[PDB]
Amino acid sequence: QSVDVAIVGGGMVGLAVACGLQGSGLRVAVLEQNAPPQLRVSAINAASEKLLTRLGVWQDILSRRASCYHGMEVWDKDSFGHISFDDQSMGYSHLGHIVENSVIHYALWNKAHQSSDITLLAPAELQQVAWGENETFLTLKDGSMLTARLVIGADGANSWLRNKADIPLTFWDYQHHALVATIRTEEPHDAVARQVFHGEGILAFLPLSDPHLCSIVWSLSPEEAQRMQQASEDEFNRALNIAFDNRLGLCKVESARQVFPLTGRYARQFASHRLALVGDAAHTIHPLAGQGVNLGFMDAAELIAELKRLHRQGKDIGQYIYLRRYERSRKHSAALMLAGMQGFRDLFSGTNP
Amino acid sequence: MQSVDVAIVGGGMVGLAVACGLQGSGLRVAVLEQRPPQLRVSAINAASEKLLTRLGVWQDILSRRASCYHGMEVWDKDSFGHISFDDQSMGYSHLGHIVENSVIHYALWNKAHQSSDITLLAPAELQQVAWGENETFLTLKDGSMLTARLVIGADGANSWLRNKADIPLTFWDYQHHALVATIRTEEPHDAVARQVFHGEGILAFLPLSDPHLCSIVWSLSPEEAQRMQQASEDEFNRALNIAFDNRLGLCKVESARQVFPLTGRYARQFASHRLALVGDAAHTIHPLAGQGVNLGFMDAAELIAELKRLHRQGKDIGQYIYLRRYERSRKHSAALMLAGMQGFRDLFSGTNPA
Amino acid sequence: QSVDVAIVGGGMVGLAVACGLQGSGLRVAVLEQNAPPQLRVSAINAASEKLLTRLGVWQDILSRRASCYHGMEVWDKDSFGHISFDDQSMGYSHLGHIVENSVIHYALWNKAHQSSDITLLAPAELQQVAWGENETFLTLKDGSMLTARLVIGADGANSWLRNKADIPLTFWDYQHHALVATIRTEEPHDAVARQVFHGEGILAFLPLSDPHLCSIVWSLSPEEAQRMQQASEDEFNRALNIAFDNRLGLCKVESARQVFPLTGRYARQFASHRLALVGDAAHTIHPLAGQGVNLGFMDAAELIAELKRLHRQGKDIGQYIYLRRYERSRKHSAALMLAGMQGFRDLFSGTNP
Amino acid sequence: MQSVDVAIVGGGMVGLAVACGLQGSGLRVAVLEQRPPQLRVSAINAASEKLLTRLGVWQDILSRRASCYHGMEVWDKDSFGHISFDDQSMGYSHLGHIVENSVIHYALWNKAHQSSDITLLAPAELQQVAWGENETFLTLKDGSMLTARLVIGADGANSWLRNKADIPLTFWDYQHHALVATIRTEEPHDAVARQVFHGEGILAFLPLSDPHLCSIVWSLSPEEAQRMQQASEDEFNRALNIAFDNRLGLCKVESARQVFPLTGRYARQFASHRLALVGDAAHTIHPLAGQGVNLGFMDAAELIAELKRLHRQGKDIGQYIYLRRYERSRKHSAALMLAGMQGFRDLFSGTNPA
Ligand SMILES: [Cl-]
Ligand SMILES: [Cl-]
Ligand SMILES: [Cl-]
Ligand SMILES: [Cl-]
Ligand SMILES: [Cl-]
Ligand SMILES: [Cl-]
Ligand SMILES: [Cl-]
Ligand SMILES: [Cl-]
Known about the structure:
- The structure is a homotetramer.
- By secondary structure, the first copy, chain A, is α+β, with helices and mostly antiparallel strands.
- Chain A folds into 2 domains: 1-70 and 93-175 and 262-353, FAD/NAD(P)-binding domain; 71-92 and 176-261, D-Amino Acid Oxidase, subunit A, domain 2 (D-Amino Acid Oxidase, Chain A, domain 2, 2-Layer Sandwich), CATH 3.30.9.
- In chain A, 31% of the residues lie in helices and 32% in strands.
- Chain A contains 10 helices and 19 strands.
- The first copy, chain A, has helices spanning 12-21, 46-54, 58-64, 101-113, 159-165, 222-230, 233-243, 293-312, 320-338, 343-347; strands spanning 2-8, 28-31, 41-44, 67-69, 71-76, 82-86, 96-100, 118-121, 126-131, 136-140, 145-153, 170-185, 192-198, 201-207, 213-220, 251-253, 258-266, 271-272, 275-277.
- In chain A, the strands form 3 sheets. In chain A, strands 1, 2, 8, 9, 10, 11, 18 and 19 form an 8-stranded mixed β-sheet that branches. In chain A, strands 5, 6, 12, 13, 14, 15, 16 and 17 form an 8-stranded mixed β-sheet that branches. Chain A has a 3-stranded antiparallel β-sheet with strand order 3-7-4.
- In chain A, a hairpin with a 4-residue loop joins strand 10 and strand 11 (145-153).
- In chain A, helix 1 (12-21) runs parallel beside helix 4, helix 1 runs parallel beside helix 8 (293-312) and helix 8 (293-312) packs antiparallel against helix 9 (320-338).
- The longest helix of chain A is centred in the last third of the chain and has 20 residues, at 293-312.
- The interface between B and D is small, with 10 and 10 residues.
- One chloride ion sits between chains A (319-321) and D (319-321).
């Protein structure tokens, strides 16, 4: 019925905000809108690893299933440039982890259930929102009502909330699709993340736990992605090996081949009156470890710090005059990503021993 | 009225490049103008050098004033990442040149005057345009008129033309300003382009001809850029040296300090009926050699190639069905830039001896 | 497998284009993406009536169910202005008809089945489209393929096609919702359409066949619309009667009360390479007879005329150089609507004897 | 630096109205300027007259030069629809006034100079603004600075301020241009405002003081507007008479013929942190008395009322939580205009005797 914070969306990013607030005393509601290696994985960078540790779920993730990488090798299909480095050259214990998204989500979901100030509502789609001066009024599809000082949108692109607040995102078609799959290679990957640049973007081999398995991200024209998805495994395996310059010898696909579109989503606003948005902007694709849930987790970390400060101070956590501090940080950061000025830093990041 | 195949609106570097590039095709072209170490310089990459060589102005540029660089060194203010390489390690004769924009423009402007199929009109601001099915009707402010099969917008962001065709750009504030200036350093730069990444973007030292002068690009918050522009030279020199990790020893600013905003400009369209746009999109700032006039020059090179082809085949160079090939190419390229997938290729680019 | 024209969407507007092309020789595909008085009705104006007659379905509509209105009365809740006129004062046999949308759709659907050059595909959602230079390639969700010289989007707002062609609409929230319902009144309506202007927009009583039934359009704040929808019938009936200045005596609601949002949708483009869009723009709400399916039917009429001309001439009906003629007409018209310069003309329109 | 409560950017009619309207509140206000029948006139409706009367400049306007109209007659070039009424039929003393914009502006400018809590700064172009949590920092081009609790943008479309706050307008080309001119007619206009609808929009005859002069608004295609602007007076006069169905007999143009574009400007936001915008949105053209400076004057009236209230209650007049009340009102009004639901009310509006 009455909460401080209502989080719309119960994905990794929304759960991370909810888990993050625990200890603050804020009453939080999250409203939802033995298995083999899942096909969707992320390259979890050093800043996300720090967040997950602060949240108390990183060790749960490492114990379930996680693949640590220690080296990086990047080159170009048509020209002579290369970047090659390892954790040791920079005083790191490791560069990052390759982790299944469902593993991360599960760890955060369990933690959320164990958090005394979090209420998870599982059938809880929104029907309406009224943006009152002093509080927000949320009506769920069952007609039940909920009041909040602050609404946090963590539901994908947040189209619905952004529409209600009249702060739309700008969508940008990146004209290429990404094919993903699990590939067994002849040579071991040696816990090195590898990527080759080419005319239709990138081809990355992300090392998994099995010394001879990688999960790939292969960007292609939408047409070529479709061809590669529908090809015989022999055609596919040969095309992949050539695209990867035979770097790990023969390749054998070992999973379904899935394709999804690549897009940018750019925000002129990350907040309004009693509204803050996380996880919905998307800028660069490369470096893979600087984006996806890593960007959303950075959104989450910064929102968490700001709300904890405001709440400490007895301030109204929903007022735009304070939320604009979070927004500014997010916009500055988005700009550095789009300007190409953030990629280098994320590429070379890692965790100290 | 005067009748041409192509009317290029804007006589800056990119528009002049298109006009010069078309020479030899037989297309009648009109260019309508709408309006010491020089402080505005570009890092001219290998693809731009190739174009300028095809156009016959590169040797002119080299003879006037140009600074060749052979090495690259990039690092991070807060971490241990670094990229460091030279031309020889990749079979190149050089990586790029630091060139004043005004030198490039003069070289193109002279070449344009020497081109038999180009008419340069100055001043020739536009008052109106009518987009007929078969030709375009251009009215200048003096009331003189011009017909063209195809209009090419090469006038900055092309706001006027884009408004008339109802295909606006999306503007994106990059929340940081760039300070530029000529800096004398204690240590010689050894013809290495250097750049450090930091919390407010980049700081690049672009080597000039004088062994101890660099032109910088220092991105900063708008407030800090203002403070650095207005600081005493001693405060500025000290802040810069620290920002650059003392990499070339003591720094002494030797010119005016100029500041300008960093922005993105994104296009859903690069063409319409009897209209093609060059030089108005802007994506990444880093790498510097991949952007600015380098992006505009690639727009130019691709438009030139497409129009020469269409003209050779007797096709109507103004029909959108044929211009969308050019558009598709620029959009695919825009996408790879914004997605972060093009920067690497441009960072490592260079010129082959042969 | 191979058609001239593929119409994406089989609603009233898409069917009207398909029926309209009949006689041209164009091969057309339409791909879909004893009952009481339906709650959704339109005020069909004189230009739509002419279209439907040219299409050969108007008499089918009149024989099924249609309500003819002969007079108009408009006034203001707070001030003294009024517009009052009838068909006779202007030499008309009638001003318009109130017709159920499902009746119109049914008539057009039957006509489409009887049209030799139309193929209706009922399970036929789109999966992909490739915009080739010479033709378009449409892949349906069953994986079957279809080629077309021209694609016509007639699927609501056409978000999907507009996204693929990168020509998005601009959405504008009109900040009010419309409540609709069937109302029995004490006084007969005398086949007069009535509307009162008020602080939250309009309240229109559209006369139905039964001399004492009207279908209403009541625009309200989203909150008040919700209140009115959920109110007891007594509260509702009293609120309505007051809002309508008791013009037809006591009111008794006789149907479900439905609410839907009011929005504008503005197009910078109505065509691209091998693509034309109908039925997706939306400008004014008042006059009701100038908008809704009336706007879409005018889109349809103009596209039909242009494609018939092009086809006569042996021209490539998909080339933007020709489609931009249709686009220009649509944009000029949209502008006159938004500028407030078209409403008067539609308000006073009617059919000559 | 100078310290004020409210800094109004733009010294046009709307900005001056806000400044004058606030007098009596105790708020310190700064206005920063950014830059015969006169040809630009407005149909000043009853709500605008009410505001101008509250501000104490309406009698000044009436004494200088103003044309009162008592009747309205609207019809259609191609059909038999018509609207025809007078003030008396509705209990009004008059419907509206046709007034030169320059007369309204001078009256407001003088009143502004007579207002003890207003400082007019001329010239005072902006160079920069910093949006601090507690106050705004304004830097003028001369380098002088100003702090304000609230910035009010009243400078045309407010592009600069809207860009800085990242809340851009949506621009919409209305595909037609308006030709304006002073026309002498054979028959007297009898203080009736007249308008005919036609295929390219409207043609309005706005009555002036002289019994046989009207100021017109003739919307046309851009091409036809150009042809009418450049035609001989005999061709123009004949075309106009036909377009007006000979309603006032023979027409004789008596001034320059000026053309300008018709456009819409739509706002998703009218406020942000320490920022409120007036006068920059534009929706319908018809009815004429409902739009133009009438829309800006309603923005002003509502902003004035809200700020006086906030100030009376000791609230921070710059916080978005309080400005969103004003915003909500302007957006609801914008919506009703674009939806076609406001025009009727404005068409029939007028002033009560008492
Ligand atoms: Cl942990
Ligand atoms: Cl050369
Ligand atoms: Cl932005
Ligand atoms: Cl075409
Ligand atoms: Cl019929
Ligand atoms: Cl007065
Ligand atoms: Cl437009
Ligand atoms: Cl606030």
